[PDB]
């Protein structure tokens, strides 16, 4: 749990979130969101910094909770590098698919989070010796969580492309990772 990359991510999300409370959501979005304009396509950070933005205490706490719990496990059991790679691929791919689904106005770490969910479960399943796993007791809630976004649970506009893309990506990485060693 006490991993550097785990905490460095939690720290950035809290910095950025606080920045969002001072400046306002939209003002941070104009700089951190996925490129809305192909002119902006060379502002490379935007492919990753969308993961840093949250729009409610609930949004961020719920994300950081999962991230601490799942990110921690991967960092501890598998190193900081494996975590970073998972975070960068899934922030890049789930941003990418989410932009296609509903455009560039989104953010949150849930893309990376479903990738961690997908990864920890598929990896604990195929490579038990890797010392990580996900309670069936959570992959439920994961499945409810994803399908609840499909129905926009009580007006909650969820990034549906991000969740599935992220989920898929984690499963691919864990499957590939569970063939070596």
């Amino acid at each position: 749990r006490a991993g550097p990359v785990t905490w460095v991510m939690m720290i950035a999300c809290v910095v950025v979130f606080i920045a969002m409370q001072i400046l306002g959501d939209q003002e941070v979005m104009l700089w951190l969101a996925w490129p809305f304009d192909p002119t902006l396509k060379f502002e490379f950070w935007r492919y990753f910094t969308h993961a840093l933005m949250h729009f409610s205490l609930m949004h961020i706490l719920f994300n950081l909770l999962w991230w601490w719990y799942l990110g921690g496990a991967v960092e501890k059991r598998l190193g900081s590098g494996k975590l970073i790679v998972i975070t960068l691929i899934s922030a890049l791919l789930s941003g990418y698919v989410q932009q296609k689904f509903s455009g560039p106005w989104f953010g949150g770490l849930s893309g990376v989070v479903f990738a961690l969910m997908g990864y920890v479960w598929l990896r604990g399943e195929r490579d038990p010796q890797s010392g990580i796993y996900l309670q069936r007791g959570l992959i439920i809630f994961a499945l409810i969580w994803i399908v609840a976004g499909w129905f926009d649970l009580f007006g909650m506009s969820m990034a549906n492309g991000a969740h599935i893309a992220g989920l898929a990506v984690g499963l691919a990485m864990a499957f590939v990772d569970s063939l070596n060693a």
């Binding site: 959501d25 969308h50 989104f106 953010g107 909650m156 969820m158 990034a159 991000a162 969740h163």
Partner: peptide, 4 residues
Amino acid sequence: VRMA
């Protein structure tokens, strides 16, 4: 906005 959409919440990932």
